[PDB]
Design a protein around this motif. Structure first.
Motif, PDB file in Angstrom:
ATOM      1  N   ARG H  37      -5.468 -43.012  22.193  1.00 41.27           N
ATOM      2  CA  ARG H  37      -4.875 -43.383  23.473  1.00 41.27           C
ATOM      3  C   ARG H  37      -4.288 -44.782  23.329  1.00 41.27           C
ATOM      4  O   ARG H  37      -5.027 -45.763  23.200  1.00 41.27           O
ATOM      5  CB  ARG H  37      -5.908 -43.336  24.592  1.00 41.27           C
ATOM      6  N   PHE H  38      -2.963 -44.871  23.336  1.00 40.25           N
ATOM      7  CA  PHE H  38      -2.274 -46.154  23.435  1.00 40.25           C
ATOM      8  C   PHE H  38      -1.991 -46.430  24.900  1.00 40.25           C
ATOM      9  O   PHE H  38      -0.962 -46.034  25.445  1.00 40.25           O
ATOM     10  CB  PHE H  38      -0.990 -46.156  22.623  1.00 40.25           C
ATOM     11  N   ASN H  39      -2.915 -47.125  25.548  1.00 40.92           N
ATOM     12  CA  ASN H  39      -2.771 -47.482  26.949  1.00 40.92           C
ATOM     13  C   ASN H  39      -2.156 -48.868  27.075  1.00 40.92           C
ATOM     14  O   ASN H  39      -2.615 -49.823  26.442  1.00 40.92           O
ATOM     15  CB  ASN H  39      -4.116 -47.411  27.671  1.00 40.92           C
ATOM     16  N   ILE H  40      -1.106 -48.965  27.876  1.00 35.50           N
ATOM     17  CA  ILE H  40      -0.442 -50.224  28.172  1.00 35.50           C
ATOM     18  C   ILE H  40      -0.823 -50.571  29.602  1.00 35.50           C
ATOM     19  O   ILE H  40      -0.457 -49.854  30.541  1.00 35.50           O
ATOM     20  CB  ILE H  40       1.077 -50.115  28.002  1.00 35.50           C
ATOM     21  N   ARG H  41      -1.582 -51.645  29.777  1.00 39.46           N
ATOM     22  CA  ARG H  41      -2.142 -51.963  31.079  1.00 39.46           C
ATOM     23  C   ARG H  41      -1.999 -53.446  31.372  1.00 39.46           C
ATOM     24  O   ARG H  41      -1.902 -54.278  30.469  1.00 39.46           O
ATOM     25  CB  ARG H  41      -3.614 -51.560  31.163  1.00 39.46           C
ATOM     26  N   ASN H  42      -1.985 -53.759  32.661  1.00 37.67           N
ATOM     27  CA  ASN H  42      -1.966 -55.138  33.111  1.00 37.67           C
ATOM     28  C   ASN H  42      -3.360 -55.734  33.005  1.00 37.67           C
ATOM     29  O   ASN H  42      -4.366 -55.021  33.036  1.00 37.67           O
ATOM     30  CB  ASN H  42      -1.484 -55.223  34.557  1.00 37.67           C
ATOM     31  N   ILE H  43      -3.415 -57.059  32.875  1.00 42.44           N
ATOM     32  CA  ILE H  43      -4.704 -57.732  32.957  1.00 42.44           C
ATOM     33  C   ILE H  43      -5.357 -57.483  34.305  1.00 42.44           C
ATOM     34  O   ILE H  43      -6.573 -57.277  34.389  1.00 42.44           O
ATOM     35  CB  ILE H  43      -4.552 -59.240  32.700  1.00 42.44           C
ATOM     36  N   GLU H  54       1.707 -66.168  43.187  1.00 45.17           N
ATOM     37  CA  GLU H  54       1.793 -67.213  44.191  1.00 45.17           C
ATOM     38  C   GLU H  54       1.125 -68.508  43.758  1.00 45.17           C
ATOM     39  O   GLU H  54       1.439 -69.561  44.323  1.00 45.17           O
ATOM     40  CB  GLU H  54       1.251 -66.664  45.523  1.00 45.17           C
ATOM     41  N   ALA H  55       0.215 -68.464  42.789  1.00 45.88           N
ATOM     42  CA  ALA H  55      -0.370 -69.676  42.236  1.00 45.88           C
ATOM     43  C   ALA H  55       0.346 -70.139  40.981  1.00 45.88           C
ATOM     44  O   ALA H  55      -0.049 -71.145  40.388  1.00 45.88           O
ATOM     45  CB  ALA H  55      -1.851 -69.469  41.939  1.00 45.88           C
ATOM     46  N   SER H  56       1.372 -69.422  40.560  1.00 46.92           N
ATOM     47  CA  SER H  56       2.159 -69.779  39.397  1.00 46.92           C
ATOM     48  C   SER H  56       3.441 -70.471  39.833  1.00 46.92           C
ATOM     49  O   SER H  56       3.732 -70.615  41.025  1.00 46.92           O
ATOM     50  CB  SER H  56       2.475 -68.542  38.558  1.00 46.92           C
ATOM     51  N   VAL H  57       4.212 -70.891  38.834  1.00 51.74           N
ATOM     52  CA  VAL H  57       5.520 -71.508  39.009  1.00 51.74           C
ATOM     53  C   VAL H  57       6.555 -70.783  38.167  1.00 51.74           C
ATOM     54  O   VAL H  57       6.317 -69.666  37.695  1.00 51.74           O
ATOM     55  CB  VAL H  57       5.498 -73.021  38.715  1.00 51.74           C
ATOM     56  N   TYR H  58       7.743 -71.384  38.080  1.00 57.07           N
ATOM     57  CA  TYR H  58       8.959 -70.843  37.483  1.00 57.07           C
ATOM     58  C   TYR H  58       9.568 -69.791  38.399  1.00 57.07           C
ATOM     59  O   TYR H  58      10.708 -69.369  38.185  1.00 57.07           O
ATOM     60  CB  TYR H  58       8.720 -70.248  36.088  1.00 57.07           C
ATOM     61  N   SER H  59       8.822 -69.371  39.424  1.00 55.09           N
ATOM     62  CA  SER H  59       9.293 -68.423  40.431  1.00 55.09           C
ATOM     63  C   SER H  59       9.719 -67.102  39.801  1.00 55.09           C
ATOM     64  O   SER H  59      10.258 -66.225  40.483  1.00 55.09           O
ATOM     65  CB  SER H  59      10.445 -69.025  41.238  1.00 55.09           C
ATOM     66  N   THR H  60       9.482 -66.953  38.500  1.00 54.99           N
ATOM     67  CA  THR H  60       9.850 -65.737  37.791  1.00 54.99           C
ATOM     68  C   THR H  60       8.791 -65.342  36.775  1.00 54.99           C
ATOM     69  O   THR H  60       9.060 -64.482  35.928  1.00 54.99           O
ATOM     70  CB  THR H  60      11.198 -65.898  37.082  1.00 54.99           C
ATOM     71  N   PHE H  61       7.610 -65.948  36.827  1.00 59.29           N
ATOM     72  CA  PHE H  61       6.590 -65.694  35.824  1.00 59.29           C
ATOM     73  C   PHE H  61       6.188 -64.228  35.838  1.00 59.29           C
ATOM     74  O   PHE H  61       5.874 -63.666  36.888  1.00 59.29           O
ATOM     75  CB  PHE H  61       5.382 -66.589  36.083  1.00 59.29           C
ATOM     76  N   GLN H  62       6.193 -63.611  34.663  1.00 57.74           N
ATOM     77  CA  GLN H  62       5.877 -62.199  34.519  1.00 57.74           C
ATOM     78  C   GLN H  62       4.484 -62.055  33.930  1.00 57.74           C
ATOM     79  O   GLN H  62       4.168 -62.677  32.911  1.00 57.74           O
ATOM     80  CB  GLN H  62       6.909 -61.492  33.640  1.00 57.74           C
ATOM     81  N   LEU H  63       3.662 -61.247  34.576  1.00 59.11           N
ATOM     82  CA  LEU H  63       2.283 -61.082  34.150  1.00 59.11           C
ATOM     83  C   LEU H  63       2.240 -60.431  32.773  1.00 59.11           C
ATOM     84  O   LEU H  63       2.937 -59.437  32.542  1.00 59.11           O
ATOM     85  CB  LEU H  63       1.531 -60.236  35.169  1.00 59.11           C
ATOM     86  N   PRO H  64       1.455 -60.959  31.836  1.00 53.03           N
ATOM     87  CA  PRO H  64       1.414 -60.373  30.494  1.00 53.03           C
ATOM     88  C   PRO H  64       0.834 -58.970  30.517  1.00 53.03           C
ATOM     89  O   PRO H  64       0.214 -58.532  31.487  1.00 53.03           O
ATOM     90  CB  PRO H  64       0.511 -61.332  29.712  1.00 53.03           C
ATOM     91  N   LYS H  65       1.053 -58.260  29.421  1.00 54.02           N
ATOM     92  CA  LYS H  65       0.644 -56.874  29.298  1.00 54.02           C
ATOM     93  C   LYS H  65      -0.398 -56.743  28.197  1.00 54.02           C
ATOM     94  O   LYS H  65      -0.370 -57.477  27.207  1.00 54.02           O
ATOM     95  CB  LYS H  65       1.845 -55.987  28.982  1.00 54.02           C
ATOM     96  N   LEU H  66      -1.318 -55.803  28.371  1.00 50.22           N
ATOM     97  CA  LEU H  66      -2.338 -55.519  27.370  1.00 50.22           C
ATOM     98  C   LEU H  66      -1.985 -54.250  26.614  1.00 50.22           C
ATOM     99  O   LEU H  66      -1.736 -53.205  27.223  1.00 50.22           O
ATOM    100  CB  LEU H  66      -3.718 -55.385  28.000  1.00 50.22           C
TER     101      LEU H  66
END
Lengths: 72, 224, 28, 149, 76, 129, 195, 95
Positions: H37-43, H54-66
């Motif tokens: 199973r190659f699962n691609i999931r968010n943290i 909302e606690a980040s900056v750059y106004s475009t920050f993309q959440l990393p992937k696992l």
RNA sequence: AAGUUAAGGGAGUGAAGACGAUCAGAUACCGUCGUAAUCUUAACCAUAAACUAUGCCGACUAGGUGUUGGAUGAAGUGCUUCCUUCAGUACCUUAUGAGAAAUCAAAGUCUUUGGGUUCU
RNA sequence: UCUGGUGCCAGCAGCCGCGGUAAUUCCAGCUCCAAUAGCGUAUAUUAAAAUUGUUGCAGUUAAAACGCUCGUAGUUGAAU
């Protein structure tokens, strides 16, 4: 006692309870292009039509009998 | 008798527009009603009678939650002794019901048997004209032509079925579990069926196709 | 099956691909 | 295939025409002279026919002259004492034995060497059944290195 | 029907009558006016008689030949 | 290794006939298979066959009449005396009213019946019926 | 003649789908560079005449059954049957009316017509239980089991099916004494088309 | 009686395949037989992604992937319901 | 693979063993540690569900989907795809082929029994 | 599936099985069957046995393809 008919394609005789064998009757055409009473007959055993080569066998037989210029 | 017709072949047989069962045999039509066989082998106005029997009745169980659900499977062998044989099987909750079902099924499965002379055209045929092999399940059977002055050398079932088929004389040879009378009878019947489907060199000349009963009595059924 | 679909019955009543041109020119 | 699997039907099929090609105006005498000169310069008959076909444009030397190339090579008396296939098999066996001596852990090379020597023995048995190889010829594996003459 | 078969060229080698796919040709290298014979499916390099120039590149098939020249099948 | 070319020829013919293909190609022709085929032909079990001669031990194309139901070889070629011809035919042939058991005899290839009629049974080749 | 020839070019019968199938090589002309096969249509016309000569040989036209299981084949088969003497079976095919002698439908024929063998395969199966010859409108990928006369056409097309049955009925009518060959018809094709 | 045509694995024209170890139990299982199973999931679940944004900056920050790439033995996969028992006829169907 | 012999190596795992748990008991499953072994070299051993439980060579018999390595011809852009073909390699369907059946394109061409050969 | 006795005892039974109160199987009477001046029993042997298979077996799963390849003897060997 009786003489069973033979498939016109494979010349193999057709048993009593084949139930897959068919008789094909073609109507003849006179000069002006209308069916006349007299006809022509064929006979196809069950195995060949079960295999699916029945249409090709009919094409060949009907070319031999000049029913059409198809051949193949 | 007074059976209401169902099929167009039944209509033809009832009014007698058909001549002999060899016609429907030649055109390989399925027989769906045993009244046709009755009409072709009525005890009177016939050369030979059709004698029934019952060769095997076997109880057969299903093993439900409550009990067993034992039914009875019956095998019968119809035969005129003159080249016409048939085998019928029927499973029913009660023995006589199974018997009647098997009888009608055998009459439906009636087939022609090619009897072959062995010494002379003057003598009537008395034996399979061939080494004919039948097979069902594991049991395989050979019927071998034998010289005229011989009975049917075979198992009791083989003799009983061959005399029904009208084979006066033959050599038999079986392999496999023949204690299973069901497919023993079925293999014998298969060999008898195969007798007429072999293309002996004498059936080499091309014969014209006679008119099938349906189109040549079509106008008779037109008004019906 | 009544008369409510009958009138509906009469109401119901009332260049080319390049290979095919050479095809037809071959045929006649 | 003798060892391993795979039919591998790849081969060369001669044309139906058995005679010399009509366009070829070349003469058999110079064909044989060229074959002799080329063998003298030193090449095995298989590659002799190869370069004859490629550079001289004379396919199927048997068509041009009514016999085979090894046959004329023998008739001139200059054919080698060990046939081509046997010689090449011996050469390959010698090379792999020399390699094995340094790398005795090469079990695969050992296996292939066994196969090659089996082929050598079968082929030599056939060739000495024919009279074209001396009866005492044996191919012991020691002097095969210099046996290449 | 296998006797008068006509379009068995696409068939693999060793058809009903096995016939090789190779052939022979003459090459007229432009501006060189020389005569030589050449084998399709060759395996060696060749040189012209008049002017020493390469003609075909030996590969696993029918070779690459040069950029130009007029090469004609020499079957009679 | 082909061993017997006649066995392969008869097996191919039998398979083609069971397929009902009306025309069959036999690759490794030989004089023995040619004689066998023309004996079958003389007895009427096949049509007119035609041998195509390359320079490579050519092929044969035989016309099938859908009329033979079993042709086979017997290997090894047992040597049969004239006495046990009747012993072997009742074991091989489906009946003694038709069918032919092919012998190779000092006077050529022939079936059991004419081997009887001219004496001198030989080695067994095959059968067809 | 040539007018009848032109009449069938315009519709889209000639195009046949992918899945070339092996038993229809002789019926396909080639595959378009797009990847869609096309049918000679000369063989379609000829086999059409031939199937009509099959049908006309049946003395009782009521012994011919033309079946369909497609929404846009139903109109065509029904109206073709009512133009000729044959009797049609549109919609769902009850899987027993050719072998069961007790059910009320039954009505076994002497001849069967199928719009598409793949979708009407059940009837094709039952036919081989009672010796029904079967004529089918086969396309590039249609199976040919228990099919005796196959005309190479297109079964997906609304107008293809409608026109195919149009020429079939027209040609059997010509074969009958109804109309002479030379007369131009009066029943127009689109009346066969599924609305 | 040969439950599966392929023997429960995907080995052909091959003698031996190196085994891996089940991510759940650690048992050795051949690589071609192991259920991967190659699962691609968010943290984080979407609610926590909103808070990260909302606690980040750059106004475009993309959440990393696992990217995890687990592999399981037959027993572990069945117990974790990654594969079902399926019917005899449905067993042939793979996709 | 394990095991044996002798040198070296020796992280991790870890037959033995020692503990801690669970349990009525637990010498087991679970956990902590841990000797041999696992690794290299040089020799032995010659066995595995060493399995596609299917010996090897040859012929014939059917469609389709792929895919690996070549060769042939043509066309999107010197570059790439499609066609044909050889040789591998699987899969799907089909059997008036087989089989006791599961199933099998071989486990078919077998009471219509004999292509050659080895082993059991 | 007649009649008495016995009642898991006695016993019978080549095999499957029968016998614990209705025993179609034991012990008896009657009747019947088969062979017949002959009929059983034991052992051996042949057919049955295509369960020794040359004719003519089987080897995926029932017993059975050597772990694999080479290889001598043996067996078998294209066409002309």
């Amino acid at each position: 006692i009786y003489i069973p008919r033979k498939c016109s394609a494979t010349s193999r005789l057709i048993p009593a309870k084949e139930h897959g064998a068919v008789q094909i009757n073609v109507g003849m055409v006179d000069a002006n292009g209308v069916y006349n009473g007299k006809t022509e007959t064929f006979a196809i055993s069950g195995h060949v039509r079960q295999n699916g080569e029945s249409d090709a066998c009919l094409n060949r037989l009907m070319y031999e009998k000049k029913l059409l210029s198809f051949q193949n | 008798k007074n059976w209401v017709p169902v099929t167009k072949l039944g209509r033809l047989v009832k009014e007698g527009k058909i001549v002999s069962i060899e016609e429907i045999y030649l055109h390989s039509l399925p027989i769906k009603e045993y009244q046709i066989i009755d009409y072709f082998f009525q005890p009177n106005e016939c050369s030979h009678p059709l004698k029934d029997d019952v060769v095997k009745i076997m109880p057969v169980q299903k093993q439900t939650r409550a009990g067993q659900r034992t039914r009875f499977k019956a095998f019968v062998a119809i035969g005129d002794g003159n080249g016409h044989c048939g085998l019928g099987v029927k499973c029913a909750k009660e023995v006589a019901t199974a018997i009647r079902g098997a009888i009608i099924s055998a009459k439906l499965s009636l087939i022609p048997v090619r009897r072959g002379y062995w010494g002379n055209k003057i003598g009537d045929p008395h034996t399979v004209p061939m080494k004919v092999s039948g097979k069902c399940g594991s049991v395989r059977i050979r019927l071998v032509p034998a010289p005229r002055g011989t009975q049917i050398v075979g198992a009791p079932t083989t003799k009983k079925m061959l005399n029904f088929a009208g084979i006066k004389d033959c050599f038999s040879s079986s392999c496999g579990k023949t204690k299973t009378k069901g497919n023993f009878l079925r293999a014998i019947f298969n060999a008898l069926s195969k007798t007429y489907g072999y293309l002996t060199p004498d059936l080499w000349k091309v014969t014209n196709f006679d008119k099938s009963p349906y189109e040549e009595w079509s106008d008779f059924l037109e008004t019906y | 099956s009544l008369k409510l679909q009958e009138e509906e019955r009469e109401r119901r009543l009332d260049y080319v691909e390049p290979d095919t041109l050479r095809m037809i020119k071959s045929l006649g | 295939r003798m060892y391993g699997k795979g039919k591998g039907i790849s081969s060369s099929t001669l044309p139906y025409k058995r005679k010399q090609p009509s366009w070829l105006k070349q003469k058999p005498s110079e064909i044989e002279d060229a074959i002799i000169k080329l063998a003298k310069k030193g090449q095995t008959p298989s590659q002799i026919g190869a370069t004859l076909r490629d550079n001289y444009g004379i396919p199927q030397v048997k068509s041009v002259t009514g016999n085979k190339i090894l046959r004329i090579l023998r008739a001139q008396g200059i054919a080698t004492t060990i046939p081509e296939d046997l010689y090449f098999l011996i050469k390959k066996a010698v090379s792999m034995r020399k390699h094995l001596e340094k790398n005795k852990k090469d079990k695969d090379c050992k296996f292939r060497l066994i196969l090659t020597e089996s082929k050598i023995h079968r082929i030599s048995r056939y060739y000495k059944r024919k009279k074209l190889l001396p009866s005492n010829w044996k191919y012991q594996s020691s002097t095969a290195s210099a046996l290449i003459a | 029907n296998p006797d008068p078969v006509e379009e068995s060229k696409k068939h693999k080698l060793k058809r009903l009558i096995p016939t090789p796919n190779s052939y022979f040709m003459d090459v007229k290298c432009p501006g060189c006016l020389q005569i030589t014979t050449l084998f399709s499916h060759a395996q060696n390099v060749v040189l012209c008689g008049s002017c020493n120039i390469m003609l075909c590149q030996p590969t696993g098939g029918k070779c690459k030949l040069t950029e130009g020249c007029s090469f004609r099948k020499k079957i009679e | 290794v082909r061993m017997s070319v006649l066995a392969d020829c008869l097996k191919t013919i039998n398979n083609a006939e069971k397929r009902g293909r009306r025309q069959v190609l036999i690759r490794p022709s030989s004089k023995v298979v040619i004689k066998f085929l023309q004996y079958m032909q003389k007895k009427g079990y096949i049509g007119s066959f035609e041998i195509v001669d390359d320079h490579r031990s050519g092929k044969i194309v035989v016309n099938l009449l859908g009329r033979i139901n079993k042709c086979a070889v017997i290997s090894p070629r047992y040597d049969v005396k004239l006495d046990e011809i009747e012993k072997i035919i009742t074991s091989i042939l489906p009946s003694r009213l038709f069918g032919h058991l092919i012998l190779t005899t000092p006077y050529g290839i022939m079936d059991h019946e004419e081997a009887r009629r001219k004496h001198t049974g030989g080695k067994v080749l095959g059968f067809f019926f | 003649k040539e007018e009848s020839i032109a009449k069938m070019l315009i519709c889209k019968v000639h195009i046949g789908t992918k899945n070339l199938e092996n038993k229809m090589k002789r019926y396909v002309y080639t595959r378009a560079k797009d990847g869609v096969h096309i049918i000679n249509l000369a063989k379609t016309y000829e086999k059409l005449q031939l199937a009509a000569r099959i049908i006309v040989a049946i003395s009782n036209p009521a012994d011919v059954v033309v079946v369909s299981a497609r929404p846009f084949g139903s109109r065509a088969v029904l109206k073709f049957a009512q133009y000729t003497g044959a009797q049609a079976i549109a919609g769902r095919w009850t899987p027993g009316m050719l072998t069961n002698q007790i059910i009320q439908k039954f009505t076994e024929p002497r001849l069967l017509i199928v719009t598409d063998p793949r979708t009407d395969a059940q009837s094709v199966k039952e036919s081989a239980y009672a010796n029904i010859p079967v004529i089918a409108l086969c396309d590039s990928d249609s199976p040919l089991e228990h099919v005796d006369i196959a005309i190479p056409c297109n079964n997906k097309g609304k107008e293809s099916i409608a026109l195919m049955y149009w020429l079939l009925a027209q040609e059997v009518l010509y074969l009958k004494g109804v109309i002479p060959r030379s007369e131009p018809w009066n029943v127009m094709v689109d009346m066969f088309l599924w609305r | 009686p040969k439950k599966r045509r392929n023997g429960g694995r995907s080995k052909h024209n091959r003698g031996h395949v190196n085994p891996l170890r089940c991510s759940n139990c650690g048992r050795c299982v051949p690589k071609d037989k192991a259920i991967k199973r190659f699962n691609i999931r968010n943290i984080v679940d979407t609610s926590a992604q909103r808070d990260i944004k909302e606690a980040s900056v750059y106004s475009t920050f993309q959440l990393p992937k696992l990217y995890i790439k687990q592999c399981y033995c037959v027993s572990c996969a069945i117990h974790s319901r990654f594969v079902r028992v399926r019917s005899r006829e449905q067993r042939r169907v793979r996709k």
